[PDB]
């Protein structure tokens, strides 16, 4: 089997995208932001405190035939940026983009963080890293792409993710018109449940390519390019009048500019961000002060490839045995 879904920019600067998934029996479609960053499936849903849901569409169980109460398991998620979700779990058909998997784990948001609650746009989180890092208790549960694995065609997804466009998720098979050139496959290690690689370096605009190992994971669920203070540094010291900002959070520059490219190596290979990819806008409405897409990740403590990254490529997330990365100029 196979799967195809469109994703689709949340807001005009890409803050995050969401694609359709059918859930349930009669099919109660929500709009999801797939991330391979992290590995639940959850949802806004008819248990979710109805304080903390505002627009959002929600799952209601009782309205699907074919939901059953995992007895028992509930679960409970913080990410990175330091929202939230939690609540219990039911098994239910979900299908993206025509690929159905029967019996998926569909946790059921009891409360949410403010973050979420905030965002009208995005009816919950599907996940696609590794199962291993799912947090249903007392019995982990299996992502989508681990359920669908072994009746797609090929063990893989792809990510191609548009800048202020839409784009695609597709499931078991690769698309060789999507891309251009070859896809470059580099290894991955999944000891901390993540898609793990290591890039081979960076330029900065028309610069030298710096050869220089970085760890970091690629992640759809994070909107910028984490990177260490060294390669940030380097990158913004092209942008007159950019500059480190305690108060906003980081790396901002004058709304005047034209930002310099930043090419990020893989193997011998090399993947260009046009500069505009890295403009996130205004600090603030009508500040002439924007936000950069490329910020250290010295405070986190691993490197991210997001968004603004992989949105350059077309990628592919190889689940065979020993799964690895490609990735794809387009």
């Given at each position: 089997?196979?799967?195809?879904?469109?994703?689709?920019?949340?807001?005009?600067?890409?803050?995050?995208?969401?694609?359709?998934?059918?859930?349930?029996?009669?099919?109660?479609?929500?709009?999801?932001?797939?991330?391979?960053?992290?590995?639940?499936?959850?949802?806004?849903?008819?248990?979710?405190?109805?304080?903390?849901?505002?627009?959002?569409?929600?799952?209601?169980?009782?309205?699907?035939?074919?939901?059953?109460?995992?007895?028992?398991?509930?679960?409970?998620?913080?990410?990175?940026?330091?929202?939230?979700?939690?609540?219990?779990?039911?098994?239910?058909?979900?299908?993206?983009?025509?690929?159905?998997?029967?019996?998926?784990?569909?946790?059921?948001?009891?409360?949410?963080?403010?973050?979420?609650?905030?965002?009208?746009?995005?009816?919950?989180?599907?996940?696609?890293?590794?199962?291993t890092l799912n947090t249903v208790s007392p019995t982990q549960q299996k992502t989508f792409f681990d359920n669908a694995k072994a009746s797609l065609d090929s063990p893989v997804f792809t990510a191609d993710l548009g800048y202020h466009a839409p784009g695609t998720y597709n499931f078991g098979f690769i698309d060789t018109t999507a891309?251009?050139?070859?896809?470059?496959?580099?290894?991955?290690?999944?000891?901390?449940?993540?898609?793990?690689?290591?890039?081979?370096?960076?330029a900065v605009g028309s610069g030298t390519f710096k050869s220089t190992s970085i760890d970091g994971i690629a992640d759809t669920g994070t909107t910028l390019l984490y990177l260490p203070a060294t390669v940030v540094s380097a990158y913004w010291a092209q942008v007159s009048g950019a500059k480190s900002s305690s108060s906003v959070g980081?790396?901002?520059?004058?709304?005047?500019?034209?930002?310099?490219?930043?090419?990020?190596?893989?193997?011998?290979?090399?993947?260009?961000?046009?500069?505009?990819?890295?403009?996130?806008?205004?600090?603030?409405?009508?500040?002439?002060?924007?936000?950069?897409?490329?910020?250290?990740?010295?405070?986190?403590?691993?490197?991210?490839?997001?968004?603004?990254?992989?949105?350059?490529?077309?990628?592919?997330?190889?689940?065979?045995?020993?799964?690895?990365?490609?990735?794809?100029?387009?």
């Amino acid at each position: 089997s196979t799967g195809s879904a469109t994703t689709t920019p949340i807001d005009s600067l890409d803050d995050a995208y969401i694609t359709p998934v059918q859930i349930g029996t009669p099919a109660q479609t929500l709009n999801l932001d797939f991330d391979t960053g992290s590995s639940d499936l959850w949802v806004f849903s008819s248990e979710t405190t109805a304080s903390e849901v505002d627009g959002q569409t929600i799952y209601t169980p009782s309205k699907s035939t074919t939901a059953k109460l995992l007895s028992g398991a509930t679960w409970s998620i913080s990410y990175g940026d330091g929202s939230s979700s939690s609540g219990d779990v039911y098994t239910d058909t979900v299908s993206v983009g025509g690929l159905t998997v029967t019996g998926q784990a569909v946790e059921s948001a009891k409360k949410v963080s403010s973050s979420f609650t905030e965002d009208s746009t995005i009816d919950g989180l599907l996940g696609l890293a590794f199962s291993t890092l799912n947090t249903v208790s007392p019995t982990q549960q299996k992502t989508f792409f681990d359920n669908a694995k072994a009746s797609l065609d090929s063990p893989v997804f792809t990510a191609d993710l548009g800048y202020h466009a839409p784009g695609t998720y597709n499931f078991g098979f690769i698309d060789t018109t999507a891309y251009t050139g070859s896809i470059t496959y580099t290894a991955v290690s999944t000891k901390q449940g993540f898609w793990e690689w290591t890039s081979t370096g960076y330029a900065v605009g028309s610069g030298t390519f710096k050869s220089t190992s970085i760890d970091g994971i690629a992640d759809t669920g994070t909107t910028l390019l984490y990177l260490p203070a060294t390669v940030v540094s380097a990158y913004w010291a092209q942008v007159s009048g950019a500059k480190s900002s305690s108060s906003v959070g980081g790396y901002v520059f004058p709304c005047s500019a034209t930002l310099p490219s930043f090419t990020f190596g893989v193997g011998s290979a090399r993947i260009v961000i046009p500069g505009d990819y890295i403009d996130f806008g205004p600090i603030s409405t009508g500040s002439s002060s924007c936000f950069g897409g490329i910020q250290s990740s010295a405070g986190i403590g691993i490197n991210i490839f997001g968004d603004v990254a992989l949105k350059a490529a077309f990628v592919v997330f190889n689940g065979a045995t020993t799964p690895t990365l490609g990735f794809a100029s387009k």
